[PDB]
Structure 1
C-alpha cells in the first residue's frame, strides 16, 4: 500500500507507465473555481506559513530546517547543507509565486516543522521522439503531438519534515496543500525528483562522482582506497596522482560568463536542449538568473573566440555536513549544471569544468547521467555511486524514457 499515493493522479505501477504511449494529463479537467480557497485543515497546534524568501530571517529558518533534517546519503554519513544564498537563488527565480512556498510551523513558538517548495518552470514534455515514430507507423500523429507546446508547470523541490515529526503522515498533507496552492494558479502538472522510489518514475539514472581532492574524500569516508592501491607502496600518493588536474583551464579564451553573454548562451543552450524529450525552455531573464555567476552558489564559464561565444559550462555548489567526523566539517561538492558545446568535444569542455572546480577548492564533482553526461564518464574518471535519481511527473501520463533523454537539471 501507498495509502497516500494511490489517491493521487500518477501512474500506479511499472506495468502502467510501460504501456503508456502518448503524453497527456491523468485527471479530470478542472478549473480554479473547483479548488477550495481555504488552506487544507491541520492540527490546531500547527499552522501554515508562507515564508518571505526576500527576508534573511525566513530564509534562515528554512536553512536551519534543511541543514538539520534534509536529505542524507543511505549510510547517514553526509547531509545536504544548501547555503542561504543558494536557497534565495533556487526559490526565487523570475516570476516566482511566493504562495508556492509552503511551510508548517507550530503555533506556540513558531518553530518551523516542515517545508515544500514549488517554482515555475516552462517545460517541453510532449510525447518522446521514438514514440512519435510508432505514431506514424499507426496514423496517430495528431494524438501524439497534442501537448508539444512547452507547458507552464510547477517544479517541486525541498520537501522536508523535521526529524521529530516523521512517520506521522505529515508530508502527504504538505503535498495536498502545495497541489492546492498551485491548482489555484491554474497549473495542473508538476515535475520532481526523489532519491527514493515512488509511483512512478518516467526516468531514472545513476549518480556519478569525480574525486577532486581524494585525500579529504578518503579521510571522511566518502571514498575508500580501492583494494588495488594496497598492492602499491604509499597508496595515497598513487590516488592523489591518478586524480591530479592541471592548475589552469586548457581552452584559451575560457572566462566567466557576463551579462552581455546572455542571448548567446540562451541560444546555444536551447538548440542543444531542444534535442531531448524532456527539457526546460528559458527566457533571457531565466538564463541570467540560473547561469550568471554568484559567489559561492553558481559558477559559469563560456568559451569565446572572435568575440563569439561557442561553448559554455556551469556548476553549482552544495556543501554537505560530514555527520560523523571531528577532523572535517564539510564536503565541498560541485554539481554539473547546464552546458553546451559546439566547437569542441564535450569531454574537453568538462575537463576545464573539473579544473576550475578543483582550483576553487571543491572536493568532488557530482552528476546524474542526464544529458550527454554519460559521454564523458570514462575519460574524466567519474565513477557511479550508490542509488538513483528518479524523475516524476504529477498528473501527466508519460512513457518510460532513458535518462539521456532528460534535460532537466534539478537543484
Structure 2
C-alpha cells in the first residue's frame, strides 16, 4: 500500500495509533555522526538547490513554482497562490535554518522542479492529559512524563512537485533529503499537516468556512445557493442578508497590535495554549515575527482596556487562483490564526475578526476545528467544508487526540 511510508518511523495503522499510551520516539537513538554527510542521491539530470529565502528573486522562483503547481481542489477550480511576502514570512522566522529549505532544479537550464521547507518550532508534545491520568491510575507516571519538556523540532510545509514530474517518486526523495538535513542539525522529530490521509494522523479536524462575500463565492462555485433558499422569491438576496456584517468593529478598545504589546500578548497567549495537549511555545522574537501586522500577510488586533491588553486575535491571508472563472482572478481568504480572550466571550472577539476581514476585502474566513474554534461556529455562521486537516508527527509515537486538544495553527 505505501512503498515509501512503510519504510519510515511513523505509525503504520489507525489501530497502532489508538493503542499508543505514552509520547516518545519511534526510532533507536542516533547521532549526527551516523547521518550521511553527502546529499541523498538524485538523477544526474537534476541538482539539489538551497534557495536564499531572504533574496527577493529566490523567493520569486519558489513563488512561481507554488503558484502553478501547489495545492488544488479535485475539480481544479482553485489553486493556492501564497504571496511572495507570505513565503518570506513563513519560511524565515527567528533562528531559521537556511539548509532546511530544500529544492530540486533541472541542471541544464535550472528550472525549479520541486521544493520542501522546514522551519524550527518549539512544541509541547508530551503525553496527553487523558493518558497521564490513566498512567497515574496504573503506577506509570514516570514513563508518561518522560517527554514533557517542550522540544525544539522541525515543522514541514510547502512540499511541491512540478505537475510535469508527478508520480515519478520524487516526493520521497525530497522528504529523505529534508530528513537528512534536519537530522544533521541534531533534530529527530517533525510535525506536519496534510489534507490527504497518510500513515497515520494523531489528530484530524474538519475545515470550516464563513462567507464574507457570498455573491462572489456563488459566482466562482466555491459556495452553492443551498436548497432551502429556493423557497424565497430572491434566493441570492436572502443569502446576502444571511451573511451581512457590521462595517465597524464592536469592541471599543480594538486596535492593531504594536511592538510594545509583545510581552502581554505572549503572556495571555501562552496561558491559553498551555491548556492544550499539543501546542507551540513562543519566544518574544517569535511572537513579534508571527503576530505583528505585515501588509497583505498577517493582521493582528488587540483589545486594550484601561491601557491593558486583555484579548487579541490574528488572521493571515492566502489567496487562491480562480482557475475556471474568467470574471475573477483571485479568491481572497482570511484564515483564523492565534487568539486569546480574557475579558470577553470568544464569539464576541471573533465577530470583530470577521468584521475586519470583510472590511478589508476578504471573500471568506476559513479555519480548522482546533483550539476553541468550535465554540463560535454556529453563532458566527461558519459551515463545515468537505475537507479535513490531518496532523502528523515524524518519529514520534503519540496517542490519538481530538482536534480540540491541538493548539498548533498551520500556515
Structure 1 residue 229: deviation in Å? 1.1
CA distance in 1 between partners of 2:390 and 2:205 (Å): 7
Structure 1 residue 236: deviation in Å? 1.0
Structure 1 residue 73: deviation in Å? 1.6
Partner of 1:358: 358
CA distance in 1 between partners of 2:75 and 2:16 (Å): 32
Structure 1 residue 74: deviation in Å? 2.6
Structure 1 residue 235: deviation in Å? 1.2
C-alpha distance after superposition, 1:82-141 (max 9, x if no partner): 000000000000000000000000000110000000000000000000000001110100
C-alpha distance after superposition, 1:288-343 (max 9, x if no partner): 00000000000000000111000000000000001101101100000000000001
Give unpaired runs (5+ residues) of structure 1: none
Structure 1 residue 76: deviation in Å? 1.6
CA distance in 2 between partners of 1:383 and 1:103 (Å): 37
C-alpha distance after superposition, 1:319-374 (max 9, x if no partner): 00011011011000000000000011000000000000000000000000000000
Structure 1 residue 6: deviation in Å? 0.5
- Residue 78 (structure 2) pairs with residue 64 (structure 1): no
Structure 1 residue 286: deviation in Å? 0.1
C-alpha distance after superposition, 1:144-163 (max 9, x if no partner): 00000000000000000000
Q: Secondary structure at the match of 2:174?
A: helix
Partner of 2:100: 100
C-alpha distance after superposition, 1:34-70 (max 9, x if no partner): 0001100100100000000111111000000000000
Structure 1 residue 389: deviation in Å? 0.2
C-alpha distance after superposition, 1:267-303 (max 9, x if no partner): 0000000000000000000000000000000000000
CA distance in 2 between partners of 1:292 and 1:75 (Å): 36
Structure 1 residue 230: deviation in Å? 1.3
Q: Secondary structure at the match of 2:389?
A: strand
Q: Secondary structure at the match of 2:149?
A: coil
Structure 1 residue 75: deviation in Å? 2.1
TM-score w.r.t. the length of structure 1 is 1.00
CA distance in 2 between partners of 1:288 and 1:359 (Å): 25
CA distance in 2 between partners of 1:297 and 1:400 (Å): 33
Structure 1 residue 79: deviation in Å? 0.7
Structure 1 residue 234: deviation in Å? 1.5
Q: Secondary structure at the match of 1:400?
A: coil
Q: Could you say what the CA RMSD is over the residues aligned between the two structures, in angstroms?
A: 0.4
